[PDB]
Design brief:
By secondary structure, this protein is an alpha/beta fold. The chain is built from eleven helices and twelve strands. It has two domains: about 120 residues, no CATH class; about 200 residues, no CATH class. The protein has an eight-stranded mixed sheet with strand order 7-6-5-8-9-11-10-12. Strands 1-2 form a two-stranded antiparallel ribbon. A two-stranded antiparallel ribbon has the order 3-4. It is globular. The chain binds geneticin and S-adenosyl-L-homocysteine. S-adenosyl-L-homocysteine binds next to helix 5 and strand 6. The PDB classes it as transferase. Keywords: gentamicin methyltransferase SAH G418, transferase.
Length: about 325
């Protein structure tokens, strides 16, 4: 019921989308919403008041692209707008798992925090694996010559293309596919907000794909990573008795064989049935002494107190 709406930026002209985006930049994230911001808040709005704000052609672009639906009397949006780190981003609303369509897109549960964790350097070529709304791709576009976003969710690819268009971004490319299949060549930066959480080894859905999606990602990272390159990964990790996640990750990566350095920053931690541990952390591959290091960095708690404590934290902890 939520996350199956049609998204069609190709049905709308590129300048019109940029103009819509400009209108969203003005009002999205500001309290006391205008009609446009309220539409993008999930509030049914009067289509005439909306027209005052985006014009009649902007009014048509919203309908054609699928950002808005005519309920007859009112307009409503299946999507929700965000403005953060200099981009505007539409995504699905935050709702319970029981009402999520198969193509439900991550509503930015962690994107703002992850962007604050990301190393602030730029470079030549970036890959955003499982790009969802496109949010990480869009931010990376400001400091990378080109960015590729990949997702197996066709709806996420359309949404990603829509968001790029809204921001007038021209150096970002999105491809539908499974993992690294549409990603040719190597990248100096790879970022992955992985679909892993509480499911362990089991595939639940596109947002909880199980540990095997991390095996496949990390096994292939060495032939995809440019020499000197950086990989950043949000993930859940499961330590079982005599079987910690880190030993498996080292194997997948071919740590010594490939000359790789990994640091894991663990933020949340919880005891399990098996006498094991469930962890959520931030994993970084970056040039340095071959090996794996794990530290405790409670960036969730610190995000809640002061979001900008996280800026360059990962740089401080590596340089
Ligand atoms: C791409 N990675 C993400 C990953 O960041 C993580 O996000 C969870 C998220 O699902 C949780 O979100 C959960 O809880 C919210 C709400 C009650 O807060 C629900 O509305 C939502 O349906 C539920 N999945 C949230 N509470 C913590 C994040 N770290 O877990 C899910 C994910 C899709 O794998
Ligand atoms: N085999 C696969 N190949 C590419 N993407 C996949 C995949 N399996 C799951 N995914 C995608 O991984 C994404 C993780 S949700 C993260 C979305 C976005 N990067 C953000 O940070 O908000 C989902 O969009 C899901 O569709």
């Amino acid at each position: 019921i939520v996350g199956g709406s049609t998204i069609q930026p190709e049905r709308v002209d590129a300048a019109a989308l940029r103009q819509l985006g400009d209108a969203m930049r003005k009002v999205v994230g500001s309290a006391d919403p205008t009609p446009l911001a309220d539409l993008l808040s999930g509030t049914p709005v009067d289509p005439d008041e909306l027209t005052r704000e985006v014009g009649a052609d902007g009014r048509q672009a919203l309908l054609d692209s699928g950002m808005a639906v005519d309920d007859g009397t009112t307009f409503s949006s299946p999507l929700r707008g965000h403005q953060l780190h200099g981009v505007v981003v539409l995504s699905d609303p935050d709702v319970e798992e029981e009402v999520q369509h198969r193509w439900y897109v991550d509503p930015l549960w962690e994107a703002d925090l992850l962007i604050r964790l990301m190393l602030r350097r730029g470079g030549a070529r970036a890959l955003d694996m499982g790009c969802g709304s496109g949010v990480l791709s869009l931010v990376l576009a400001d400091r990378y010559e080109s960015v590729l976003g990949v997702d197996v969710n066709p709806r996420a690819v359309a949404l990603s293309r829509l968001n790029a268009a809204l921001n007038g971004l021209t150096n970002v490319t999105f491809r539908e596919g499974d993992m690294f299949e549409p990603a040719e060549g190597r990248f100096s930066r790879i970022v992955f907000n992985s679909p892993t959480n509480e499911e362990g080894n089991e595939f639940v859905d596109l947002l909880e794909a199980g540990e095997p999606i991390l095996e496949t990602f990390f096994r292939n990272v060495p032939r995809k990573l440019e020499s000197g390159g950086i990989v950043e990964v949000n993930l859940a990790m499961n330590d079982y008795p005599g079987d910690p996640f880190r030993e498996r990750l080292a194997d997948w990566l071919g740590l010594t064989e490939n000359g790789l350095r990994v640091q894991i920053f663990t933020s949340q931690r919880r005891a399990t049935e098996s006498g094991g541990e469930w962890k959520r952390g931030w994993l970084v591959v970056a040039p340095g002494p071959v090996g794996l290091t794990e530290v405790e960095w409670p960036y969730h708690d610190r995000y809640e107190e002061d979001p900008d404590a996280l800026l360059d934290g990962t740089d401080r902890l590596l340089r």
